[PDB]
Write a protein that binds this ligand. Structure first.
Ligand SMILES: [Mg+2]
Lengths: 380, 532
DNA sequence: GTCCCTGTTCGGGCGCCC
DNA sequence: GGGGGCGCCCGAACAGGGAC
């Protein structure tokens, strides 16, 4: 087969990311898996003359996962329908990618190191000989084939939609509970997007209002004024004239009482005028609400939310990791991109454990936030 | 040695080194032998390249510029083997390879860059891995690995710990069979051109290995000798700290924090006498005979942490009480502001990641914090936080949040409306408050920031209020710090605030938007911004 | 943007190993 | 007047958010 020449981008070298500590069972598994990829010629041993490295690990059958995030950033550079259909299924189609040799000039960039319990042995390095599972250029090379491989299925069933993201293949159908399940199976032989509801903003309803209650109300509404323009705090703020004790009871005026009702009015509709730009970066912010509940918003410019939502359910690390993948999944289905997350967790805490809970083919980029104890008050 | 070479290049646009230089009679002594045995070769003036040499009976070459122009390597040494990761073996041998590097051929097309010259008052090339060349360690370790593989495949149930050129070999065999197998390994290495001098073949315990003393059932460190200076340079403390960090892997309760903080913006340093205490206490502990044990996979791994005081922590990892595999410490100051529960989280993380390296799994913890306190903190904290499977162990001083913040306002308590303001050109500020009971106060500050004036404001309120207080602040900054419940800070002001918080029976802190003409926040702002 | 401040990575000192 | 690794500590440099 003809290998397709690939390059990096101008003025940018290959990945040099250090391997990280691995559990015995993950190493054991990886060593088992790597041998047969070596035995079958899919990977070949290399040494330190190759200056590149990309992290590897295993998620559980185990499945080798390679964090090609750095390579993906460095390699040369969608159905609205899928988002619409009652049932969408996700397949693991990565193994297909091994059936295509890779430009030998490029292979040096795919190098990884298997670590060693108690450093009994130096690392054992391997290179990819074929399109690696999880790499950006893999879908681009194998697409012309892919179109061909399943077009019978597509013309046999035009009301079933298939979308491809990396090793993932998204297949969505409007068919009933059990016939979705059975026209899946002739694809393997060959999750519903409309159950996703926007999480609105809500104001507390109560019979009696204190100075504190109002302050907290005026603070929340003030913030919401950024996302919602119409909101007004004028009438409420003046109930707080002078320096009152926080527990004091404040009778609501006529004018404030429905300025609130009008504020409740605005928040009661959908936000307008936000449009997904494929060229721009996609951002997800997550907040911990306690309760085993998590709020998130997806946006491209600050306050321009493409979507807001809620992941609700205790393991803070596991839950956040699980929130990250559910959120990411959605963002692929809807937009075909993964978003850079802003995570409310310390870097080291997250780096300690997130791989013990990951069950996806991809890995999103993320950074870490020193978050306000405030924006928590805003999505309740 | 029939090892095949590893191909090496310089970086794409660069050329070899051209540097120039009575240890000379020492050097000709050595170099002449090295040529006799083929480690080097003489070259003529046609070869343009040269790198400096020097001697210390030992010859070494300064290859700094060569190294700069040499390609990058992926280092294959990912860490250091540790004794507590060793499983108990019936028969054990420790071995060393002699002239490791020089038994390993360099890349013929590369050798001309290793050119050097013994000086005049004779020029050579390297034919093997030079010492001081950047690529040699990785190329050796990688090569040693490939050399050891056929034997490793053949003897799957023999453990070879392979560290550069040092070999620990353990087996479950009786001492005769085992010695045979060691010999077979020795013959294997010779065929690949690697000599293991008998003089470095250790056939009985205690085994000297990697800095340790390996006995059959227990291990220990080789003697540690702390430097006992009269005057203390910044470096002597760094040396002393490092020696104490190395001891803390098996000597319990080693402390470094106070010795550590003597190094800030820093020549000789007076020992703060908080330091000479922990030093002296450390000196006492090194008079103790201690030992560790080996690892049994059929048992649970258990870590246990204690608080030494002032963000200083000690731990022990064991499987059976009183017989711990390893010990250790944590004392990192992470964050400008912190508390004990944060740091215990951090200590748990260090130990976890350390255990994954040494044992390939995570220990069960034994922590001096009540399940309650943890759940309390986990509640009030906004970013995600977690600790694995753990027991509570009643071992004072227990770990606690020193104060708490009210979730609701305190009825009847005086409400302080605090604010602060600072001018950026003049660095002049004002902090103060306005309260419900009619009280009012403004102080001015020299050399301050806006974030500092907001901290003063809050501090003011806590000094002047009674045992209970509601505070309202328009400062995202100050609220962020205080809602995290620090008990330690780099900031004196935050520390002062902390001593106050500990004293109150109840504190409630609330946030309001600034500049929205709201409550007494406008009143105190006007008092406080006046002049700024 | 600035300033401030808090977080992280980086490089250097020391330790230890080869 | 040399190299590679891991750890611990520091300050310096940089990124990013809040408040001007
Ligand atoms: Mg103000």
């Amino acid at each position: 087969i003809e290998t397709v020449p690939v390059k990096l981008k101008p003025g940018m070298d290959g990945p040099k990311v250090k391997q990280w500590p691995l559990t015995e069972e993950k190493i054991k598994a990886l060593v088992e898996i790597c041998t047969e990829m070596e035995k079958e010629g899919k990977i070949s041993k290399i040494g330190p003359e190759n200056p590149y490295n990309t992290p590897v690990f295993a998620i559980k059958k185990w499945r080798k996962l390679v964090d090609f995030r750095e390579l993906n950033k460095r390699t040369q550079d969608h159905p609205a329908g899928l988002k619409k259909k009652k049932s969408v299924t996700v397949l693991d189609v990565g193994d297909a990618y091994f059936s295509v040799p890779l430009d030998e000039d490029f292979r040096k960039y795919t190098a990884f190191t298997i670590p060693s319990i108690n450093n009994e042995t130096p690392g054992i390095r391997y290179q990819y000989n074929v399109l690696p599972q999880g790499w950006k250029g893999s879908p681009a090379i194998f697409q012309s084939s892919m179109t061909k491989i399943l077009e019978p299925f597509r013309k046999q069933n035009p009301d079933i939609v298939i979308y491809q993201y990396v090793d993932d293949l998204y297949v969505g159908s409007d068919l009933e509970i059990g016939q979705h399940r059975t026209k899946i199976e002739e694809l393997r032989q060959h999750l519903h997007p409309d159950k996703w509801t926007v999480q609105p903003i809500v104001l507390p309803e109560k019979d009696s209002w204190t100075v504190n209650d109002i302050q907290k109300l005026v603070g929340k509404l003030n913030w919401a004024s950024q996302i919602y323009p119409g909101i007004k705090v004028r009438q409420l703020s003046k109930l707080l004239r002078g320096t009152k004790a926080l527990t004091e009871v404040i009778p609501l005026t006529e004018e404030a009482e429905l300025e609130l009702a009008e504020n409740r009015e605005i928040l009661k509709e959908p936000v307008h005028g936000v449009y997904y730009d494929p060229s721009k970066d996609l951002i997800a912010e997550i907040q911990k609400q306690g309760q085993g509940q998590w709020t998130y918003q997806i946006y491209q410019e600050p306050f321009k939310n493409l979507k807001t939502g809620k992941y609700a359910r205790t393991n803070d690390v596991k839950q956040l990791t699980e929130a990250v993948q559910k959120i990411t999944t959605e963002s692929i289905v809807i937009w075909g991109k993964t978003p850079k997350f802003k995570l409310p967790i310390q870097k080291e805490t997250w780096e300690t454990w997130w791989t013990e809970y990951w069950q996806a083919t991809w890995i999103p980029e993320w950074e870490f936030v020193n978050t306000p104890p405030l924006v928590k008050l805003w999505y309740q | 040695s029939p090892i095949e070479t590893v191909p090496v290049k310089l970086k794409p646009g660069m050329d070899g080194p051209k540097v120039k230089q009575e240890k000379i009679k020492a050097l000709v002594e050595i170099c002449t032998e090295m040529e006799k045995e083929g480690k080097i070769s003489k070259i003529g003036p046609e070869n343009p390249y040269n790198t400096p040499v020097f001697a210390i009976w030992r010859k070494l070459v300064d290859f700094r510029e060569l190294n700069k122009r040499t390609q990058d390597f992926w280092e294959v040494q990912l860490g250091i083997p540790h004794p507590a990761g060793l499983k108990k073996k019936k028969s054990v041998t420790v071995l060393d390879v002699g002239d490791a590097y020089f038994s390993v051929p360099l890349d013929e097309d590369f050798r001309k860059y290793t050119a050097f010259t013994i000086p005049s008052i004779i020029r050579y090339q390297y034919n093997v891995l030079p010492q001081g060349w950047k690529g040699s360690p990785a190329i050796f370790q990688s090569s040693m690995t490939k050399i050891l593989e056929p034997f490793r495949k053949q003897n799957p149930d023999i453990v070879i710990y392979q560290y550069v050129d040092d070999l620990y070999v353990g087996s479950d065999l009786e001492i005769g069979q085992h010695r045979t197998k060691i010999e077979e390994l020795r013959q294997h290495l010779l065929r690949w051109g690697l000599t293991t001098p008998d003089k470095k073949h250790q056939k009985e315990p205690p085994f000297l290995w990697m800095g340790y003393e390996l006995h059959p059932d227990k291990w220990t460190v080789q003697p540690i000798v702390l430097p006992e200076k009269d005057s203390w340079t910044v470096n002597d403390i760094c040396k002393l700290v490092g020696k104490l960090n190395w001891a803390s892997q098996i000597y319990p309760g080693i402390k470094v924090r106070q010795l550590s903080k003597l190094l800030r913006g820093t020549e000789v340093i007076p020992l703060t006498e908080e330091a000479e205490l922990e030093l002296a206490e450390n000196r006492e502990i090194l008079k103790e005979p201690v030992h560790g044990v080996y690892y049994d996979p059929s048992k649970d791994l258990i870590a246990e942490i204690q608080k030494q005081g002032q963000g200083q922590w000690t731990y022990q990892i064991y499987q059976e009480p009183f017989k711990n595999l390893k010990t250790g410490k944590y004392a990192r100051m992470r964050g400008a502001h912190t508390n004990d529960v944060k740091q215990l989280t951090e200590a748990v993380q260090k130990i976890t990641t350390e255990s994954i390296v040494i044992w390939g799994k995570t220990p069960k913890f034994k922590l001096p914090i009540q399940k309650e306190t943890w759940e309390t903190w986990w509640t009030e904290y906004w970013q995600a936080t977690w600790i694995p499977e753990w027991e509570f162990v009643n071992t004072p001083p227990l770990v606690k949040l020193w104060y708490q913040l009210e979730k609701e306002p305190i009825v009847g308590a005086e409400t302080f409306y605090v604010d602060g303001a600072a001018n950026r050109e003049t660095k002049l500020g004002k902090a103060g408050y306005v309260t419900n009971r009619g009280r009012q106060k403004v102080v001015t500050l020299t050399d301050t920031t806006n974030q500092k004036t907001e901290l003063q404001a809050i501090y003011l309120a806590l000094q002047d209020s009674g045992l209970e207080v509601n505070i309202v602040t328009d400062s995202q900054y100050a609220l962020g710090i205080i809602q995290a419940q620090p008990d330690q800070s780099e900031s004196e002001l935050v520390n002062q605030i902390i001593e106050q918080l500990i004293k109150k029976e109840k504190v409630y802190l609330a946030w309001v938007p600034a500049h929205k003409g709201i409550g007494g926040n406008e009143q105190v702002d006007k008092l406080v911004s006046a002049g700024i």
